[PDB]
Symmetry: C6
Subunit: 67 residues, 6 copies
C-alpha cells in the first residue's frame, strides 16, 4: 500500500486513542499521540515527551482502529 | 533481484497468511498483514498495530509462500 | 504534522528545561539542551556531550512543554 | 571496492550455498538465499522468510566463496 | 541549530581532548579523535580504530568544550 | 575531515592487516578485509563472510595504521 502511516497516527491523534509504544530498547510508553512529524511522535501522559520514530518498534492501540 | 519485498508482503496480505514478525528487540508478533506502506506494516490480531519496518528483523510465514 | 521536532527542542533549549534523554542502549542522560543540529544534540551537565539523534529513543522534559 | 554485495549474494543464490545469517538481535538463521532485492533477502529452509537487510549483521557461507 | 557536529568534533581533534565514546552495544572507548568524515570517527589510543558514527550514542569530553 | 573511511579500509585490505570487527550485537569477528563496497565489508578467515557496515561498531587493527 501507500501513505498509511500518517492516516493511522492521525486517527490515534484525533480520536485520542490510548496507545502503547514499544521502543527498540524494551521501554513501553503509554499515553496519547499529541502530534507527529517526519521523524518524531509527541506522546502525552503526565508530560509530553518526544519519541524518535527510529526507536519505535510498534504502536499498539488500546482498541481496534480501522483505516 | 529487484522489487521483491512488496510481492512477498502482498501475497501475505491478500492470502491472509499467518505470520510471525520478529522485532530487533526480541518481541515476536503474530497475526495477519492487513496493509503496509513504505515504512510500516499494519499487523492485525486482537487489534491492528503499526509496526515500523526498521524494527523488523524477519517475517516468517506459517506456510511456504512462493513469489 | 510537520516540522515539530525543532520547535520542541528549541523550547527546551531556550527555556533551559531539564530533560532526561533515553538512549537505545539504556543509558539515561540528564541535563539541558545546549544546542542541536540535523544529527546531534549537545547536552550540558558537568560537561557538554554530543548525543547522536539516531541513538536517542525519547526526550522527556521535567515539566509540561506545549508547542 | 564497488558493487560487491550483489555478486556475493548472487553466487550464494545461484550456487545454493548453505548460509548462516546473524541478526542484530542474536538470532542465527540457516538456509539458502532464494532471492534478494534492495532491502530484503528471502531465505529458504522449511519455509521462505523475508529478512530485512538492516537487521542482518553478517552472512556466513558454509564454504569459501570467491568473488 | 545548524552545522554543529563538525565544529564540536573539530575542537576535540585540534585540541586533543580526551573523550569517552559510548557505543550502541555498551562498549565505552577512550582516546583522542584523530580525524573524522561523513560516516566514521578515527579514534586513537594504542592504535587508531575506525568507529562508525551510526554506532555511537554519545561523545563525552573529559572537560568542558564550548562551541 | 572528508573521505577517510575508504583510505582506512584500503590500507587494511592492501596491507592484509589483521582486524577485529565489533558488531552491534556484541559479536567480535577477526580476519582480513578482503574487499568492501558502499554497504558491506568482505572479511576473510576460514571463509569469507559478508558483514554489513550498518552492523559494525568499530574496526580495530592489530597494529597502528596511519592515514
Amino acid at each position: 500500500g501507500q501513505m498509511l502511516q500518517d492516516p493511522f497516527l492521525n486517527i490515534l491523534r484525533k480520536e485520542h486513542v490510548p496507545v502503547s509504544i514499544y521502543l527498540v530498547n524494551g521501554i513501553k510508553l503509554q499515553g496519547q499521540v499529541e502530534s507527529f512529524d517526519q521523524y518524531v511522535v509527541l506522546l502525552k501522559n503526565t508530560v509530553t515527551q518526544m519519541v524518535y520514530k527510529h526507536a519505535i518498534s510498534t504502536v499498539v492501540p488500546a482498541r481496534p482502529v480501522n483505516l
